[PDB]
């Protein structure tokens, strides 16, 4: 039994809510919050910019040290860093950015990173400004993630569309 509230159950292990992931993280303080990162961990906009802003830029400072040491992530890859004031850990996951020309088949690989963690608060990878079909992303999520995932969808109209079209 945990502290997530108001989530709609989609499957045995996937739950969904129309919510700002930052506000959910502040309220729940989960073990793992997922960031929709890019390979450079440059947290400018979207989920990443919003999470980083809520950490007072500490996420960016930590991320720059990570990249200076290790180089960039792969599309489809991830790294575990601090969750700062928002969570114990942040799992930075790189879904493909279709607007940048990245391979949509890598979305499944991106979601596979979630399976290394028992419970996650996460956004809908590759949706919105990353340019992929969000209905497809939700289907890949449900068909790939086996651990317990609480999805926070920011856009209200999108949430309603995802629920109403879910198979």
Ligand X SMILES: O=C(O)C[C@@H](NC(=O)c1ncnc2[nH]ccc12)c1cccc(F)c1
Residues of this chain that bind ligand X (CB under 6 A): 20-22, 36, 46-47, 50, 123-130, 152-155, 158
Is residue 138 a contact partner of residue 165, using CB atoms and an 8 Å limit? Answer: no
Token pair, residue 103, equals: 């391979």
Name the phi and psi angles at 112, rounded to 5.
-60, -30
Selection from 132, 70, 72 nearest residue 106 by Cα: 132
For residue 54, give both structure tokens: 């809520």
- Output 89 or 127, the one with its CB closest to ligand X: 127
- Looking at the Cβ atoms of 36 and 140, the one nearer to ligand X is 36
Comparison of 67 and 98: residue with beta carbon closer to ligand X: 98
Closer CB to ligand X, 50 or 140, in the complex:
50
Nearest distance from residue 47's CB to ligand X, in Å? 5
Which of 45, 43, 88 minimizes the C-alpha distance to 67?
43
Q: Give me the least distance between CB of 141 and ligand X, in Å please.
A: 10
d(CA 48, CA 62): 13
Least Cβ distance, residue 104 to ligand X (angstroms): 13
- Minimum CB separation from ligand X for residue 64, in Å? 21
The residue of the chain with the least Cβ separation from ligand X equals 128
Question: Structure tokens of 129?
Answer: 């400004």
CB of 69 to ligand X, least distance (A): 25
**Is 106 or 127 the residue whose CB approaches ligand X more closely?**
127
Strand order of the sheet with strand 148-153?
Answer: 8-9, 14-18, 148-153, 119-122, 32-36, 89-93, 78-82
């Amino acid at each position: 039994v945990n502290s997530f509230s108001g989530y709609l159950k989609l499957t045995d292990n996937v739950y969904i809510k129309n919510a700002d992931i930052v506000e959910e993280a502040k309220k729940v303080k989960p073990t793992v919050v997922v960031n929709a990162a890019n390979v450079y961990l440059k947290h400018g906009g979207g989920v990443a910019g919003a999470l980083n802003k809520a950490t007072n830029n500490a996420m960016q400072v930590e991320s720059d040290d990570y990249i200076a040491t290790n180089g960039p992530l792969k599309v489809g890859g991830s790294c575990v860093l601090s969750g700062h004031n928002l969570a114990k850990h942040c799992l930075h996951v790189v879904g493909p950015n279709v607007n940048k020309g990245e391979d949509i088949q890598l979305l499944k690989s991106a979601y596979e990173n979630f399976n290394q963690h028992e419970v996650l608060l996460a956004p809908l990878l590759s949706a919105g400004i990353f340019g992929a079909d969000p209905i497809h992303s939700l289907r890949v999520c449900v068909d790939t993630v086996r651990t317990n995932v609480y999805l926070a969808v920011f856009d209200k109209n999108l949430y309603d569309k995802l629920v109403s079209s879910f198979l």
